[PDB]
Subunit: 337 residues, 4 copies
């Protein structure tokens, strides 16, 4: 309904397309893809996926500049400079920025220069970019926002249950550590990053790094400003991560009561965003889960009556991509066109 582009057909760009494809009566219309790798590459990697498996749909190249998914043709262009895009010419309403390189206003704005009406960054925005997490603060979105951010995968897993903890128990302060699957931003073998730790062979190490949620939860939950901080430990799994949150709360409590609080929200205001799992599972079991965060109930602990530790699972690729679709639906729903 809404004319959508995908700038950056990588893990999130492709997960997004496949997430979108599975939705019924979607308001979005993905008409174009900017894949610097080309048509053959876009069709191949969309069909065959090391993490999601083979796409259950007819996918093929259509000519020299498009691909088709179950008959639907999707234009495919290739340009590293978004100021060279044909968004205006195509009448593109929303650009899904998934390249990871245009996360500030001047960068994402290049899409507007090219004629796109709006931009949704699949990552934290740098600068003065409205950030939103579905199930946490999306009601604050307004059609005037020309550039928005859907935050990070970790922020999407944390914020939902942090919101519950703060409302029910009141968070004085907390820390978080995410044991995170590796991502394309890491090097296969010891190379070159900025980040000397992400420069190291990712399938061989536990890699401490930069955390991507910590301040950002305060962005979507202002009451938490200056109350949280954390880090990330990248480990040798290709997908699915888990956050370990420890917080001192003002109201004394115990593990079972904390879990109960999560189940209540899970069955109500956070249905489809938060889930609570009582089974002794491991990361692989959470692949392709549509929720943003799944509490591992049996792992919840309370020390000294007010120090609560919570363990939550998240599919950083798929679960996050479903949220990108959700945020895109909101954009469409609140359109002033």
């Amino acid at each position: 309904k809404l004319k959508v582009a995908i700038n950056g057909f990588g893990r999130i760009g492709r997960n997004f397309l496949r997430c979108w494809h599975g939705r019924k009566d979607s308001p979005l219309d993905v008409v174009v893809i900017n894949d610097t790798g080309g048509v053959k590459q876009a069709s191949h990697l969309l069909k065959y996926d090391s993490i999601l498996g083979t796409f259950d749909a007819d996918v093929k190249t259509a000519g020299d500049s498009a691909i088709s998914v179950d008959g639907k043709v999707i234009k495919v262009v290739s340009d590293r400079n978004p100021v060279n895009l044909p968004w205006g010419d195509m009448g593109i309403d929303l650009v899904i920025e998934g390249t990871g390189v245009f996360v500030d206003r001047d960068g994402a704005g290049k899409h507007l220069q090219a004629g796109a009406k709006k931009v949704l960054i699949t990552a934290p925005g740098k600068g003065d970019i409205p950030t939103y997490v579905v199930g946490v603060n999306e009601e604050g979105y307004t059609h005037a926002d020309t550039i928005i951010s859907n935050a990070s995968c970790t922020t999407n897993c944390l914020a939902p249950f942090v919101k519950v903890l703060d409302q029910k128990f009141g968070i004085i302060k907390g820390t978080m550590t995410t044991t995170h699957s590796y991502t394309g931003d890491q090097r296969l073998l010891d190379a070159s990053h900025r980040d000397l730790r992400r420069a190291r062979a990712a399938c061989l190490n536990i890699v401490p790094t930069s955390t991507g949620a910590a301040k950002a939860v305060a962005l979507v939950l202002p009451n938490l400003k200056g109350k949280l901080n954390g880090i990330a430990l990248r480990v040798p799994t290709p997908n699915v991560s888990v956050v370990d949150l420890v917080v001192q709360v003002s109201k004394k409590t115990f593990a079972e009561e904390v879990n109960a609080a999560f189940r209540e929200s899970a069955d109500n205001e956070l249905k489809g965003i938060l889930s609570v799992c009582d089974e002794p599972l491991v990361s692989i079991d959470f692949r392709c889960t549509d929720v943003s965060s799944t509490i591992d109930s049996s792992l919840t602990m309370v020390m000294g009556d007010d120090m609560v530790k919570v363990i939550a699972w998240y599919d950083n690729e798929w679960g996050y991509s479903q949220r990108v679709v959700d945020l895109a639906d909101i954009v469409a729903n609140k359109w002033q066109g």
Copy 2:
């Protein structure tokens, strides 16, 4: 002087022998190895190691029942039943119990049935077994102890710096999470295991599992009884782990002061046990670390002035094995003639 026997030539048993081989003027004499796998196996796996690399020493079989390391002939026996071992006949003073199956008094005691004078379990002891962590409470060891425990790798990493935190700031309570390398106790592919999570493919998942390290810390640091708890996350790396500790302390502080407190101890009472690393390193850098615990200084955080988060690295196989040697050395030094 101390005639030593290694029961269970596995990861720890082999790491132990190589750790011991590297010491100068050792008061220990490893005369025999109980390897149910045989002499060829013992010689081969001691020489070639997927984690430590090839042993820089002349290793070979010596007849049917021995092996030699740089000329030093060692005996090799094979019996799954410790009562039937020739410890008395051989005059064995101390047995390094590294099978992982004789961790209680009745089990480890079988070595005493057999004639050994003392047993040192390379793991937490079950029941009433004296537990010691070098650099924390080893001064409490007495020659009267027939059976002793060197705790777990995680306890050895945690205790040292927990001791420092408690002394300098006073720990009210806290929680810990160890992102741990897999170990032989896990299954390569989904297979039977009493622990339904450890039963799952170890190189494919992030596996949550219980840990006693929290309560064990209280064993060697009584002041901490009932103040800690935690869990473990087994991840797809073959060696080297990291502990994430969050504690509320009584004295307000900040990250750099906390890191300073650790360096002070590291340059003094905990020299050779605790180190503080200021480099942006990853898990493979810490292989073959003779200390028990290395603080990653740049990851230390303090929230709300009294919630301290510390990240510490540890080579669970080698570092721990150097501690086993250390404890053995203490046994030999306190032996009563």
Copy 3:
């Protein structure tokens, strides 16, 4: 129909059940499972699988000899000694031997001693045990065989296209190497193993070992007796393997002719057993393929006009289990009764 019992509820045992569950109008009725790990374990590991994903069926324990799959109750017993199994009492017609420890006549026979009418070993049989590979020599099966073998996963990948090569070009001699995913028989970390190479950390090494696929091929294709040999290279992937076969043929040929030969069989006598893939795919893309062998057409080479090199993919767990089901179906179809 045909009261089937699964002995050994491991990778194959569970893949088998799931493969069977997916069949329509199956002549087989799986009524019992001997799982030494217990009911809870059986239900859990059948539901959650690190390789196949979460089973899309209602699986739960059935109060505690039993489990239920979509309402179908399956009895669960636990005994490491087959002679003590209630096969006779239950009227069990065919036992799927998937423990990997009862592969000879005396061992597998234990199931007959226990009352089972027939045994199907999910592996090469030791000694005089009729071996069959569907699509190659299954027409030779007779109800008189009390104990049969479905060969190995590599033999099931190799035989089908070797049969084609021998008929179409005539194999003078050849060699084979299978770059095989690791299996439960390997060790997670360096540990005891009769085979000093499989004793080594499986996810950290390229491990050369044995196979019997070569001589086993001769079993189902007599014309090939003494004409082939080979080895295996176990690598760090959890599932899916690939065979590299090099043979000198009597009739000069070229790569595309060879590929054509495979497509002819694939569309005819070997439909559902052999496939030919023209896509530039990788191992993960072949997960859950029902065929026994998939030729990677673009990799086919011919040197000196008569030295043919063929690369074929196979899902060693799933593809092989579909063959077990197939052979079981034949057993049922030829039952006297």
Copy 4:
């Protein structure tokens, strides 16, 4: 004594420096490194290495544009365009091309435009570029060659023993498959790549791909022109690979005679280049071996008296780098000022 510059401080670039550092009385003087990543990054990654371990040398940054190794300062520049490099200004005699992007004459020639006297590509050269393999055809090198190639890692493993096989038995034709560790050219997670197979998650798949090694082996051993071909299977190991070569020979033989032939050469003309291992080892055991190729003797087979299969290990990073140093040594030894 030869002024050497390293272009592209990656896996090979760094392995090269470390190999060079370990040589005694080297005729090479590495005075500069072109690392687009910067000084801090060059120092760090040279010191800490996921595959080689921590560099046993004092490594630090020296100012804003150099690094020091045990006191020796090495200049560090940063430019992606070789024409702009200060080779002429610095008087650079030989440039080690390890970027992987300047492999043809026009590309590597950019270094000559920049003032360098000679270029050594650490990879197969494209077009008319003299290719050499130490121990095979290096005696053919002449100072007139402004741009030379040290071939590929697999070519360096294969050529040496292929040379023996051809001389001793006469190779009519053959095929080869290399089960190769992943390299930086692959993607960590499904991502864009001209090669649709190399685009797939490298630590999750058996990856089928190129090797010009077969035709390259022809380049250094003319007698083998048009007689060999092959492919590569990239697998989930970070370093160390193995080649499987099958060849029909004109002189009937047997496995032990073939192994003998390799030991003869290994103790004589190919000492330091080829080795023969009789131990049942796995890939990890061959890390950091200086030789180019190590035959795994117990794996050698001969079918039909003339079809020879040989398995050889090689450390693709380190062993190859040792050859780069050897070839650089030749350049210095044959310099004509």
